[PDB]
Write an enzyme that holds these catalytic residues in place. Structure first.
Site, PDB file in Angstrom:
ATOM      1  CD  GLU A   1      -3.073   1.014   0.514  1.00 30.00           C
ATOM      2  OE1 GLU A   1      -2.549   2.127   0.537  1.00 30.00           O
ATOM      3  OE2 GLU A   1      -4.213   0.849   0.107  1.00 30.00           O
TER       4      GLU A   1
ATOM      5  CG  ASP B   1      -3.444   9.830   5.745  1.00 29.93           C
ATOM      6  OD1 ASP B   1      -3.894   8.733   6.098  1.00 29.93           O
ATOM      7  OD2 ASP B   1      -3.174  10.078   4.567  1.00 29.93           O
TER       8      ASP B   1
ATOM      9  CE1 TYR C   1      -7.575   1.177   6.323  1.00 25.29           C
ATOM     10  CE2 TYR C   1      -6.235   0.730   4.356  1.00 25.29           C
ATOM     11  CZ  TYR C   1      -6.355   1.235   5.664  1.00 25.29           C
ATOM     12  OH  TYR C   1      -5.284   1.796   6.329  1.00 25.29           O
TER      13      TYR C   1
END
Ligand SMILES: *Cc1c(COP(=O)(O)O)cnc(C)c1O
Ligand SMILES: *Cc1c(COP(=O)(O)O)cnc(C)c1O
Ligand SMILES: [Cs+]
Ligand SMILES: [Cs+]
Ligand SMILES: [Cs+]
Ligand SMILES: [Cs+]
Lengths: 256, 389, 389, 256
Positions: free
Chosen positions: D49, D60, D175
């Site tokens: 990834e 993030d 995910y």
């Protein structure tokens, strides 16, 4: 009150107009001031107008304003001013002494107690710079009761009703400051005012003979004397020697 | 005179003989003006449309929690200028205009009056010179700029102690000669008559509104209306329309300074004796032999060494009571309004508030309706409370 | 979704999947709120009683002399807070309260939003953390203090360029986790839906008043209403109620900066292309390969690198026109308002005014009714215009 | 798309769960990054990834945020990222490569042209961190047309209607990030979602055997790999040697 009336009689009978210096009591020191007044006098001063140090002079210009500061820095108080006035009177019995004042210093110990100590040290008149003719009465009765002349400023913008009031209420002399110069002198003598003494811009002998000729009984030199003292800050012989020669020049210019 | 210069024994016109025709013409004009509908409406329209009146009356929500006090604030801090100075200055420039005068003289210490004369003159095309003391000019750099900006001429006094006291004199000397072209715009309900009566009639709408607003909201007149007393316009502005409502108290707060017992304070009315200065007979801060001294306060716009004649008089017939608040009592009421209601009050008005907080903390179960006069916002003070804190 | 996230192609909810339940609950709550009379009245009472609404509409007297332009100013500079930020921030803390939330997250650059979230949270007893970039915190020392004072917790961002861009992200990360206790209070009509529609409905009263006030005063709708466009709330606040009055123009001023031709500017809507950032698809300032860059303006509160979705859209169907004003055109309109009307306008709003002065100087015999949105006062700017001057 | 389906087949037939490292392309330099990915791979990485450098990562945390700044300072561009991805694919034909992305970088050159160059350099899937399932369609069709799996994050606060949507729209793997851990895995296999890979807090082998045992097809270690690179800033042998031993430890922990 009286000594003025004696001065103007004497001057009249010898074709003379009065010349009066102003100066601030305590400038630039107590010792100094007493020597300066004895020099003004012997130089020819017919009467004296003294200033007492006060905080903000709402009726005075920058020169007198920092002149007061010079006397403040000298450690002059009200008490030292009455002590000075008494010894000036001790060496000089005949000369009129008048005082420029502001109403807080009169009022501060009682209006009557101030006029009481004035009469008791020999002061002849008091002009209180910021008490108009229509706020006069406590100050005016109190001066009359201790036989001190209340002096009033008769201003350029003087309406006729004022001119009647000033003439009725002052004593000693009228302080002169629209209306033609001569016309004011006329109306005041009509209304029977006390001797009008011109105080506006008297600084060169030509103006003293001008004031005398106009019918003004003489002239008060305000700022000029103070300025000679300022110029001569620490020039002591020139301080007095210039003062001597100035007063006698001014005075000479009034005997016609 | 057309009107009375005296509030009991206080007041008068104790000015050099030369200024007297100026004062008598100003009285004659103000009496005409207050009688002319045209003058009232033009004055009203500026207040409403340029300044933002009525100002708000805020019910405090969180400062009186778990007490029986109800605090309201009259929000003169939301006035154009963020300080009540604006309602008299508009009304007096309109008067100068109605007199045919073309200039405005004014004096200042902190800045707020100078700025408020400048913003009124710019608005009405009058030439404007502000006299300000050098000490004050140096300290008040942000306000000098704001004045200059708006086209006002600033003359730096620095004679005497170079304070407002001195600035006030020089401005009058200038008026002696300029008085038929220029108009002196006196900062507060103090000095020679008629400036005591004019400066009240032009701040009077504060009272007029607080009353109808409390009547609308609470249905009954307030119990006490608190207000600080720099020289008296904001206070006399609030009191004026309540004075004949004997049931309503009027408390005026005075600068306690570092402490009454320390002398560095500005509390002439309760701890300084009567005198004659700035053309009036009223209480003042002076030495034992009549030399006037400088007062003191954390609030620059509260330190002035005397008080309005009519305030000295309402104290004497017991109609109003005047109290004190120290500098640290002002600071604490400042942080408390900020942290609690989210209003940064001016340090001047915090003195009025500190007093109403003390009244409620000291007697918590007393039900009482208060109204403080919040009279300026505190943006000006966030640097000074930050030099302390 | 209950409402449309799109103004034509602009807008959306382009957020990480985790924030989506927060946004959908906020939409559901705002739709309830706007439908509840109780909510409207409480909101109204704060605006009226705590903030000072209606604000005034001033007819300019001396700036349009010898031209045929009639200038009016909407006086959001006389709002509690001296900047229109206050009407949406009250309405969104009321909403948080109505949602059962107890905290407020917020971000800032210049200070004015942080301060306005802090003054609303103090007023309603909400815990408040402001995220502010270190660059910004250092530069904005006077506003940090004013926030701290009112009890707001200030966290200094200094990652990325340590600007608002960065502050905006960290605040959302915090929201991802806090969202059921806390509410993010977004500064402007920008970002993820529904903050575009909420921030307009809570600034909408500006338009509602300007309209009835011009109708009362002039008897006819304005010709154009000018307004600057930092991120769009003040502008969209003014436009909103005039948008369906096809006769009325709407010009929005954008920061020309040092010059369009110099890049250091904040004019995304006319000279920067579409992109996806801060949860919306709308025009923005970015490099040729999608990296967003910092904009620029003399007015700190005008430099933000995108614009509201609905502003991008009214430009596309030609309903509003957006123009530019450089820094020196802002300065000159600043000094001119001060020296002429006696109002110190905020440098942000001077951009809207400079544009209406240009419109009248360029065609002096055109009779045209203008209304500028004066949206903040300039006390904050008197030090910066004084670093230039 | 396909290489994932080959990976999960192979791992299933040998009782294994996938272990996937994340790392940012260009950190702390281009040269560096290619050596770091060849070490992750030979150490045992089943898939990769990668992150592409973008301005503000709204999805993030601080570590990746300044990791992007380290790659920016390296003078890494979009262009140098596609060049890197192509040579990574040249030395490694079989391994799945997925990309973490933000919607401005996809949109910037046209959504289709981005999925076009992805397919042309060998990228298997793309996760675009800030495009929610309800703003998916332009990105989702475009990935399918160039046979690139659209990866979606299935979050902790996942309502059931979401779970249906994600399972219907993603490909490659889901995910994973109220709801019991196991209960999510169950509902996703019911709904026929692609292999759910746990990404929340995978940093110690105990959690990899935990994720594998729970029914998650394996685990993605985000921040951990980045941190070892941060610790070892300029410690290059320890940089790789720690990375080697970490990946093989993590990987060991999934073959049961
Ligand atoms: C100038 C000032 C005053 C002091 O004087 P007043 O005559 O009482 O009004 C009061 N409040 C504020 C906020 C001021 O700036
Ligand atoms: C914060 C600010 C703005 C910029 O943004 P808007 O969204 O357009 O409102 C505008 N005006 C003032 C005076 C501000 O402080
Ligand atoms: Cs108002
Ligand atoms: Cs006082
Ligand atoms: Cs109002
Ligand atoms: Cs902008």
């Amino acid at each position: 009150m009286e000594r003025y009336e004696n001065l103007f009689a004497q001057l009249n009978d010898r074709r003379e107009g009065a010349f009066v210096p102003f100066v601030t009591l305590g400038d630039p020191g107590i010792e100094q001031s007493l020597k300066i007044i004895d020099t003004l006098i012997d130089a020819g001063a017919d009467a004296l107008e003294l200033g007492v140090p006060f905080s903000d002079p709402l009726a005075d210009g920058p020169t007198i304003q920092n002149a007061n500061l010079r006397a403040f820095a000298a450690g002059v108080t009200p008490a030292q001013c009455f002590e000075m006035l008494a010894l000036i009177r001790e060496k000089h019995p005949t000369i009129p002494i008048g005082l420029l004042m502001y109403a807080n210093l009169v009022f501060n110990n009682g209006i009557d107690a101030f006029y009481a100590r004035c009469e008791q040290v020999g002061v002849d008149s008091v002009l209180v710079a910021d008490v108009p003719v229509e706020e006069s009465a406590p100050f005016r009765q109190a001066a009359l009761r201790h036989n001190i002349a209340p002096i009033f400023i008769c201003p350029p913008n003087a309406d006729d009703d004022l001119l009647r009031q000033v003439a009725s209420y002052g004593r000693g002399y009228t302080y002169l400051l629209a209306l033609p110069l001569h016309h004011l002198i006329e109306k005041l003598k009509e209304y029977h005012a006390a001797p009008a003494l011109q105080g506006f811009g008297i600084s060169s002998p030509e103006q003293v003979s001008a004031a005398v000729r106009a019918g003004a009984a003489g002239a008060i030199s305000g700022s000029a004397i103070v300025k000679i003292i300022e110029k001569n800050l620490a020039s002591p012989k020139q301080m007095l020697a210039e003062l001597r020669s100035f007063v006698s020049a001014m005075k000479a210019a009034s005997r016609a | 005179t057309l009107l009375n210069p005296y509030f009991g024994e206080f007041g008068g016109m104790y000015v050099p003989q030369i200024l007297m025709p100026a004062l008598n013409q100003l009285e004659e004009a103000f009496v005409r003006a207050q009688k002319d509908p045209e003058f009232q409406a033009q004055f009203a329209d500026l207040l409403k449309n340029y300044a933002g009146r009525p100002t708000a009356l805020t019910k405090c929500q969180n400062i009186t929690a778990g007490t029986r006090t109800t605090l309201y604030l009259k929000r003169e801090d939301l006035l154009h200028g963020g300080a009540h100075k604006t309602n008299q200055v508009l009304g007096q420039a309109l008067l100068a205009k109605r007199m045919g005068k073309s200039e405005i003289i004014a004096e200042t210490g902190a800045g707020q009056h100078g700025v408020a004369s400048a913003l009124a003159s710019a608005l009405l095309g009058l030439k404007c010179r502000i006299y300000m003391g050098a000490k004050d000019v140096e300290r008040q750099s942000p306000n000098v700029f704001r004045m200059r900006l708006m086209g006002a001429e600033v003359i730096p006094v620095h004679s005497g102690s170079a304070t407002l006291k001195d600035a006030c004199n020089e401005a009058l000397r200038d008026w002696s000669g300029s008085y038929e072209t220029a108009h002196y715009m006196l900062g507060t309900a103090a000095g020679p008559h008629p400036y005591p009566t004019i400066v009240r009639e032009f701040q009077r709408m504060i009272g007029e509104e607080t009353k109808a607003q409390i009547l609308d909201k609470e249905g009954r007149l307030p119990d006490a209306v608190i207000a600080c007393v720099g020289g008296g316009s904001n206070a006399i502005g609030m009191f004026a329309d309540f004075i004949n409502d004997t049931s309503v108290g009027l408390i005026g707060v005075e600068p306690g300074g570092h402490g009454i017992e320390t002398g560095e304070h500005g509390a002439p009315l309760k701890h300084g004796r009567v005198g004659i200065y700035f053309g009036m007979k009223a209480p003042m801060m002076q030495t034992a032999d009549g030399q006037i001294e400088e007062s003191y306060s954390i609030s620059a716009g509260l330190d002035f060494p005397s008080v309005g004649p009519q305030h000295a008089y309402l104290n004497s017939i017991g109609r109003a009571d005047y109290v004190s608040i120290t500098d640290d009592e002002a600071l604490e009421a400042f942080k408390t309004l900020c942290r609690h209601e989210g209003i940064i009050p001016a340090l001047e008005s915090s003195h009025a508030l500190a007093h109403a907080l003390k009244m409620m903390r000291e007697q918590p179960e007393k039900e009482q309706l208060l109204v403080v006069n919040l009279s300026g916002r505190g943006d000006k003070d966030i640097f000074t409370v930050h030099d302390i804190l």
